[PDB]
Nucleic acid binder design. Structure first.
Length: 48
RNA sequence: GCUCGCCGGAAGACCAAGGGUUCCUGUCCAACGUUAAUCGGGGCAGGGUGAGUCGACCCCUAAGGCGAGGCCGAAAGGCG
């Protein structure tokens, strides 16, 4: 899951979780096809 | 979906006339439907009509209308 820890200043602590494209490009492709089968653009049928 | 029953020179398919979105899809049931309606030709929102060769347009005229001038009529106008 690519866990990484660091320290910024004072008492804080940052983490920089840099996941790969397979959990990023799919994250775009999971959020596209759940819209077109549900939403109705004004020019078309409901779900085509 | 399965049996049942009727029309079958029509209660079947088409075109002109006429109407004017009534056709398709989603959604809604208050009103309209001679009853209840999830359904509709009802309410709302979105789509749908592609032509050198089919029709209109155009070329040509019939009945008949209009009629430059012209004839005739108090005026309007009547014929050609």
């Amino acid at each position: 899951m690519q866990v990484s820890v660091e320290t910024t200043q004072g008492l804080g602590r940052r983490v920089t979780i840099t996941i790969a494209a397979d959990s990023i490009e799919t994250a775009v492709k999971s959020e596209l096809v759940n819209v077109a089968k549900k939403v109705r653009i004004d020019g078309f049928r409901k779900g085509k």
